[PDB]
Design a protein around this ligand. Structure first.
Ligand SMILES: [Cl-]
Lengths: 4, 238
């Protein structure tokens, strides 16, 4: 999981 | 003829319309922006999903801020007379009211303005959908337990105003995964807002972040439907  | 109602958009034109997918994965080193791993899964999922909805999909990869503006302007100058609607999907980094080109920001307003009722006459009175998978800030959700020129626009945001948006490097973004699944399952049954409501619930319930960093761990997300539409939208007709 990564954020934009 | 018999009694006629105008509660839903006319979606039986010869063509459903264009579905422009701007897939930005790799950014110029100078921007300092990370690669958006998993975005290709999103771009592929969307292409297939809208293909089944009969949209003329055009996938564009790694576009600069200049190329995005030029693409939008050119598309808005096309003749959409035989097209029922218009869809544009933006997959990139972002902030509130901003989406990033590979070399810099682009105000979302600049992109959407090209399609205003008075600037794109062949789309006047037709639904213009902007699906945006990008952050709208840096907040984290901790969880718990004459017609107006701005009319006929729908913004299906991936996250609430001021919040980060989540993307999984293997499965793609939470929002896009959900959006595509809901469209494939309900596009031939439900009105668009009802489909997007299902998307909201799917993202809200089935996803939670996992991170080695306590600050980013166990976080939730809720998409944000923003509608200026004047009629109900069904992808099917007859
Ligand atoms: Cl961000």
């Amino acid at each position: 999981d990564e954020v934009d | 003829s018999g009694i006629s109602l105008d509660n839903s958009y006319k979606m039986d034109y010869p063509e459903m319309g264009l579905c422009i997918i701007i897939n930005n994965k790799n950014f110029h080193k100078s921007t300092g922006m990370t690669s958006r791993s998993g975005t290709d899964v999103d771009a592929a999922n969307l292409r297939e999903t809208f293909r089944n909805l009969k949209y003329e999909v055009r996938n564009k990869n790694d576009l600069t801020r200049e190329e995005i503006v030029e693409l939008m302007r050119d598309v808005s100058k096309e003749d959409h007379s035989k097209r029922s609607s218009f869809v544009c999907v933006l997959l990139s980094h972002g902030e509130e009211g901003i989406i990033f080109g590979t070399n810099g920001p682009v105000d979302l307003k600049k992109i959407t303005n090209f399609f205003r009722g008075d600037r794109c006459r062949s789309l006047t009175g037709k639904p213009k959908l902007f699906i945006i998978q990008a952050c709208r800030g840096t907040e984290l959700d901790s969880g718990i337990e004459k017609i107006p020129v701005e009319a006929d626009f729908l913004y299906a945001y991936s996250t609430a105003p001021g919040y980060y948006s989540w993307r999984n490097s293997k499965d793609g973004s939470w929002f896009i995964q959900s959006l595509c699944a809901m469209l494939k399952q309900y596009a031939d049954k439900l009105e668009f807002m009802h489909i997007l409501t299902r998307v909201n619930r799917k993202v809200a319930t089935a996803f939670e972040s996992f991170s080695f960093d306590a600050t980013f761990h166990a976080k939730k997300q809720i998409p944000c439907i923003v509608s200026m539409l004047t009629k109900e939208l069904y992808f099917y007709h007859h």
